[PDB]
Design a protein around this motif. Structure first.
Motif, PDB file in Angstrom:
ATOM      1  N   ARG A 169       9.542 -19.106  10.381  1.00 58.39           N
ATOM      2  CA  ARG A 169       9.945 -17.950   9.591  1.00 58.39           C
ATOM      3  C   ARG A 169       9.350 -16.648  10.117  1.00 58.39           C
ATOM      4  O   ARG A 169      10.082 -15.679  10.342  1.00 58.39           O
ATOM      5  CB  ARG A 169       9.533 -18.162   8.131  1.00 58.39           C
TER       6      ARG A 169
ATOM      7  N   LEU B 103       8.070 -14.745   8.403  1.00 59.36           N
ATOM      8  CA  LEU B 103       8.096 -14.044   7.123  1.00 59.36           C
ATOM      9  C   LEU B 103       8.412 -12.559   7.252  1.00 59.36           C
ATOM     10  O   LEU B 103       8.624 -12.043   8.355  1.00 59.36           O
ATOM     11  CB  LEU B 103       6.768 -14.234   6.389  1.00 59.36           C
TER      12      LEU B 103
ATOM     13  N   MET C   4       6.886  -9.289   4.939  1.00 61.50           N
ATOM     14  CA  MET C   4       6.134  -8.781   3.796  1.00 61.50           C
ATOM     15  C   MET C   4       6.507  -7.319   3.586  1.00 61.50           C
ATOM     16  O   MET C   4       6.030  -6.435   4.303  1.00 61.50           O
ATOM     17  CB  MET C   4       4.634  -8.949   4.015  1.00 61.50           C
TER      18      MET C   4
ATOM     19  N   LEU D 151       6.301  -3.755   2.041  1.00 62.11           N
ATOM     20  CA  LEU D 151       5.195  -2.982   1.490  1.00 62.11           C
ATOM     21  C   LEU D 151       5.529  -2.530   0.074  1.00 62.11           C
ATOM     22  O   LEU D 151       6.626  -2.029  -0.187  1.00 62.11           O
ATOM     23  CB  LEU D 151       4.889  -1.777   2.378  1.00 62.11           C
ATOM     24  N   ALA D 152       4.600  -2.779  -0.852  1.00 58.65           N
ATOM     25  CA  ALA D 152       4.853  -2.442  -2.272  1.00 58.65           C
ATOM     26  C   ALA D 152       4.657  -0.940  -2.487  1.00 58.65           C
ATOM     27  O   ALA D 152       5.276  -0.396  -3.421  1.00 58.65           O
ATOM     28  CB  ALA D 152       3.930  -3.244  -3.156  1.00 58.65           C
ATOM     29  N   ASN D 153       3.835  -0.302  -1.651  1.00 62.69           N
ATOM     30  CA  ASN D 153       3.533   1.138  -1.854  1.00 62.69           C
ATOM     31  C   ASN D 153       2.774   1.693  -0.650  1.00 62.69           C
ATOM     32  O   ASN D 153       2.374   0.892   0.218  1.00 62.69           O
ATOM     33  CB  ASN D 153       2.690   1.355  -3.110  1.00 62.69           C
TER      34      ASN D 153
ATOM     35  N   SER E 272       1.172 -16.160   5.545  1.00 61.66           N
ATOM     36  CA  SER E 272       1.169 -14.829   6.132  1.00 61.66           C
ATOM     37  C   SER E 272       0.199 -13.948   5.359  1.00 61.66           C
ATOM     38  O   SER E 272      -0.219 -14.272   4.244  1.00 61.66           O
ATOM     39  CB  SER E 272       2.569 -14.200   6.136  1.00 61.66           C
ATOM     40  N   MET E 273      -0.156 -12.821   5.967  1.00 60.47           N
ATOM     41  CA  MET E 273      -1.099 -11.882   5.383  1.00 60.47           C
ATOM     42  C   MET E 273      -0.576 -10.462   5.531  1.00 60.47           C
ATOM     43  O   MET E 273       0.229 -10.167   6.419  1.00 60.47           O
ATOM     44  CB  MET E 273      -2.477 -11.991   6.037  1.00 60.47           C
TER      45      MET E 273
ATOM     46  N   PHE F 161      -1.193  -6.097   3.649  1.00 56.92           N
ATOM     47  CA  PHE F 161      -1.857  -5.217   2.700  1.00 56.92           C
ATOM     48  C   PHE F 161      -0.864  -4.814   1.623  1.00 56.92           C
ATOM     49  O   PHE F 161       0.021  -3.987   1.889  1.00 56.92           O
ATOM     50  CB  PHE F 161      -2.415  -3.980   3.400  1.00 56.92           C
ATOM     51  N   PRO F 162      -0.952  -5.368   0.412  1.00 57.55           N
ATOM     52  CA  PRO F 162      -0.005  -4.974  -0.643  1.00 57.55           C
ATOM     53  C   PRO F 162      -0.086  -3.506  -1.012  1.00 57.55           C
ATOM     54  O   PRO F 162       0.946  -2.891  -1.308  1.00 57.55           O
ATOM     55  CB  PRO F 162      -0.397  -5.876  -1.824  1.00 57.55           C
ATOM     56  N   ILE F 163      -1.278  -2.919  -0.991  1.00 54.56           N
ATOM     57  CA  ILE F 163      -1.444  -1.526  -1.393  1.00 54.56           C
ATOM     58  C   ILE F 163      -1.158  -0.577  -0.238  1.00 54.56           C
ATOM     59  O   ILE F 163      -0.449   0.418  -0.413  1.00 54.56           O
ATOM     60  CB  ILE F 163      -2.860  -1.312  -1.963  1.00 54.56           C
ATOM     61  N   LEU F 164      -1.699  -0.872   0.941  1.00 59.54           N
ATOM     62  CA  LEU F 164      -1.501  -0.053   2.133  1.00 59.54           C
ATOM     63  C   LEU F 164      -1.958   1.386   1.910  1.00 59.54           C
ATOM     64  O   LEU F 164      -2.906   1.636   1.166  1.00 59.54           O
ATOM     65  CB  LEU F 164      -0.033  -0.078   2.565  1.00 59.54           C
TER      66      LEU F 164
END
Lengths: 51, 51
Positions: A43, A45, A47, A49-51, B45-46, B48-51
């Motif tokens: 995959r 994957l 990810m 980015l949420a913000n 996977s890894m 940064f959700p906030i970034l």
């Protein structure tokens, strides 16, 4: 003396009841399994980015 | 930042032998900051959700 030496009858043998030296028991050590940390990268994957 | 008279007089050369400032001295300013961050490990996977 009813003790002739010619008969090659070597009996049957002798039963080894035990051994002079006991055999030590080592700890079993298995190896890799189904999830044995292998590379497959299907995959990779994504990810977002949420913000 | 306000610098020092020692620095402003070392910037000009002309010092005697084994004084270190025999040649004019040039300076550069560097700034570093240390910050926190959050890492999320999921689905192999890894990121940064906030970034």
């Amino acid at each position: 003396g009813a003790n002739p030496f010619r008969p090659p009858l070597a009996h049957q043998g002798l039963s080894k009841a035990h051994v002079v030296k006991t055999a030590v028991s080592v700890a079993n050590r298995s190896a890799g399994a189904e999830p044995f940390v292998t590379r497959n990268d299907p995959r990779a994957l994504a990810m977002e980015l949420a913000n | 930042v306000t610098m020092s008279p020692e620095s402003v007089v070392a910037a000009a050369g002309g010092g005697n032998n084994n004084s270190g400032y025999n040649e004019p001295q040039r300076f550069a300013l560097v700034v570093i900051a240390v910050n926190h961050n959050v890492i999320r490990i999921m689905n192999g996977s890894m990121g940064f959700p906030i970034l």
